[PDB]
């Protein structure tokens, strides 16, 4: 059996979501949370990770609301060893390497603040994340003018040196 | 071999990071761009010495930290050494970004303590032989002091629910 | 590179300061100190002079306090071959010629008991004294009455002959 | 040539300085002003002989030292000679001030020793031909006496840290 379903990630506007595949849930949920604290001062987040054996969604973080939401999204996804992070006061570009560098992390499915979906397949054994829909799909290739625009915007955002 | 002890000049609260790299004209700009990705709002100056033309290159996003980074770098003089002075971010938030850079060999040290760079000089040029990162420890912590620091670490913000 | 900074001379009220440019620091700090002793009996002072090669501020004198202060001021000025003198029980007019006539002295930047500043320029090589602010600046020309006043005061101070 | 030996009259502890100058009416006053700049609190009398009116000019800031300086100067008589009697200052503190004066040619001697001025006299006037500055030495110091004077010089106040 292979039934596929689409899960809409529930998160408030401005909150960044990161979905990944890990190992050793009881240790990692806490250890990865500690690691996230070292990435950006003031980062606020919730992290939840699924443990297969007891079929439990573990969670922690340093923000009640994001913790509740991370756990809710994680248990819905259900897939074993999948972890969900919901954060604010930090961007994926400031934390992805910290996550990829964690010894119990296998991979990261995706990360952003766009409307986000997790595609899950369920078999007679359990569930598996087969992909993520990170926002709407692109359907046109940028023009030279649009190239200039994005580059000016990147500098305006703060990625500029003297 | 002549040995000099250079006091790093930096404002109170400013973090300094000294390292050894390569390809100065490219790296001074590229590492600066990388630092911008480490922590939003980070303010810094970075300078790096180029041997051939004997020039201290520099950039960043803060006039004063750039001038100070360049001053410290040229006083150190050693080729391919880079000096970073930053604020609005801590070493623990950026060291991996620096170690991850393809033109970086190593990082001598990083902190906000009174800092010194020990430099050796030969007939060719100079070499960083070590760094004095603050005062030296002279007492091993007691069990009570262990509890003290662990409570402080949590109070600083390193705590999870 | 040329960064300019202003250094405020730290000294007790009533203490006279003399800043100069010399040569052969290890010899001169001691020899000039000996010379000062011949200028006015009872003179108490501290003298410090910067030696470039070892980047050390040398000092001596015959007063612990003035010696510590002279060295503190000299090391912060930093400029090689610059010497700083802090004295009491003697006035500049009693010792300037002794200093100017020392064989290892190039010049004297200034001397007085007014609030005093040393303007220093720093390059990639080292530091240089580019000037001294000897007290507040004059902004008005004396009147004939003030002229009579200062002349009476000079006599009252003791510059009067029978 | 007649030769006279003049004993300088001065109280114990007073220092005498005899010199040869020029332009007496200006110099007696100007050199006195200069002496005041040498050491704060200096007390003295200065007299100088003017040839054409055959007058001994004098000034200073001490009535008795002035009277004595003038008496000694007129007894010496020689034109353009000046005599200084001072206290609250030593020759080592003022000799350069005197030598630096534009109207001073030379300084014959200076001390607090028993002092004599040897004067020669012609049909025109008088001339200082020398000074007897205290007793004459008759023994060369021993190595031990060297140590003795050097310790005394430091004790007097000529010592640095
Ligand atoms: Na897949
Ligand atoms: Na080393
Ligand atoms: Na100047
Ligand atoms: Na003679």
- Report the CATH number at residue B81: 3.40.1520.10
Chain B residues 92-151 within an 8 A CB cutoff of chain A: 92-93, 96-97, 100
Query: What secondary structure, in 3-state letters, does chain B show?
Result: CEEEEEECCCCCCCEEEEEEECCHHHHHHHHHHHHHHHCCCCEEEEEEEECCCCEEEEEECCHHHHHHHHHHHHHHCCCCEEEEEEECCCHHHHHHHHHCCCCEEEEEEEECCCEEEEEEECCCCEEEEEEEECCCCCCCCCHHHHHHHHHHHHHHCCCCC
Q: In a 3-state reduction of DSSP, which class is residue C70?
A: helix
Which residue among C30, C91, C101 places its CB closest to the CB of D160? C30
Q: In a 3-state reduction of DSSP, which class is residue C18?
A: strand
Q: What does chain D come to in residues? A: 161
In 3D space, the residue among D114, D131, D53, D43 whose CA is nearest the CA of residue D84 turns out to be D43
CA distances in angstroms from D116 to A134, B70, D82, listed in the order given: 113, 72, 14
Q: At what angle do helices B91-99 and A25-39 cross, to 10 degrees?
A: 100
In whole angstroms, what is the distance from residue C90 CA to residue C16 CA? 8
Ligand nearest to the CA of B106: 2
Residue with token string 């902190």: B111
- The experimental technique behind this entry is X-ray
In 3D space, the residue among D157, D126, D120, D133 whose CA is nearest the CA of residue D54 turns out to be D126
Instruction: Say yes or no: D29 contacts chain C, CB-CB below 8 A.
Output: yes
* Residue A151 burial (10 A CB sphere; 0-12, 13-18, 19+): exposed
**Which secondary-structure segment (H or E) carries D80?**
none
- Of all residues in chain C, the one with the smallest CA distance to D36 is C159
Residue D92: its chain C contacts at CB < 8 A?
38
Q: Are D80 and D4 in contact (CB under 8 A)?
A: no
CA distances in angstroms from A64 to A19, A44, A151, D104, listed in the order given: 19, 10, 38, 96
Q: What are phi and psi of C63, to 5 degrees?
A: -150, 115
| Cβ–Cβ below 8 Å for D38 and C94 | yes
Q: Note down the domain range covering A147.
A: 1-162
Task: Give all chains having 3 or more CB-to-CB distances under 8 Å with chain C.
Answer: B, D
Which residues are near ligand 2, the ion (C-beta closer than 5 Å)? Answer: B 129-130
Degrees to nearest 5, angle at CA B32 with B30 and B33: 65
| Cβ–Cβ below 8 Å for D32 and C161 | yes
| Cβ–Cβ below 8 Å for C1 and B75 | no
In whole angstroms, what is the distance from residue C161 CA to residue D48 CA? 15
Instruction: Say yes or no: B54 contacts chain A, CB-CB below 8 A.
Output: no
In whole angstroms, what is the distance from residue A141 CA to residue A154 CA? 18
In 3D space, the residue among A49, A26, A46 whose CA is nearest the CA of residue A37 turns out to be A46
DSSP state of C71: H
In whole angstroms, what is the distance from residue A4 CA to residue A120 CA? 6
| Cβ–Cβ below 8 Å for B74 and C124 | yes
Ligand nearest to the CA of B18: 2
User: Cα–chain-centroid distance for residue B17?
Assistant: 1
Q: Are C83 and C29 in contact (CB under 8 A)?
A: yes
Q: Are D48 and D29 in contact (CB under 8 A)?
A: no
Instruction: Say yes or no: B161 contacts chain A, CB-CB below 8 A.
Output: yes
What sign for the dihedral angle of Cα D65, D66, D69, D75?
negative
| Cβ–Cβ below 8 Å for A159 and B36 | yes
How far apart are the CA of A6 and the nearest CA of chain B, in angstroms? 30
In whole angstroms, what is the distance from residue D119 CA to residue C102 CA? 36
Instruction: Say yes or no: C1 contacts chain B, CB-CB below 8 A.
Output: yes
DSSP string, chain A: --EEEEEEPP--TT-EEEEEEES-HHHHHHHHHHHHHHHSTT-EEEEEEEETTTTEEEEEES-HHHHHHHHHHHHHH--TTEEEEEEESS-HHHHHHHHHTSTTEEEEEEEESSSEEEEEEE-SS-EEEEEEEESSPP-SPPPHHHHHHHHHHHHHHT----
What sign for the dihedral angle of Cα B30, B36, B38, B42?
positive
Give the number of domains in chain B: 1
CA distances in angstroms from D42 to C34, C89, D14, D110, listed in the order given: 22, 13, 12, 16
* Residue C117 burial (10 A CB sphere; 0-12, 13-18, 19+): middle
Q: Which residues pair with D49 in a beta bridge?
A: D56
């Amino acid at each position: 059996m292979v039934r596929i379903e689409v899960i809409d990630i529930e998160k408030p506007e401005g909150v960044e979501v990161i979905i990944g595949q890990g190992n050793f849930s009881i240790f990692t949920v806490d250890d990865l949370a500690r690691a996230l604290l070292t990435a950006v001062p003031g980062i606020k987040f919730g992290i939840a990770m699924n443990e297969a054996k007891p079929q439990l969604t573990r969670y922690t973080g340093n923000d009640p609301e994001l913790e509740a939401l991370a756990a809710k999204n994680a248990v819905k996804i259900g897939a074993g060893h999948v972890f969900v992070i919901l954060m604010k006061n930090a961007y994926p570009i400031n934390v992805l390497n910290t996550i990829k560098n964690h010894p119990a992390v296998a991979m990261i499915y995706g990360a952003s603040e766009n409307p986000f979906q997790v595609i899950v397949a369920e078999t007679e054994l359990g569930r598996a994340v087969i992909g993520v829909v990170d926002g709407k799909a692109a359907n046109k290739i940028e023009t030279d003018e649009q190239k200039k625009e994005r580059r000016e915007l990147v500098e305006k955002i703060g990625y500029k040196i003297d």
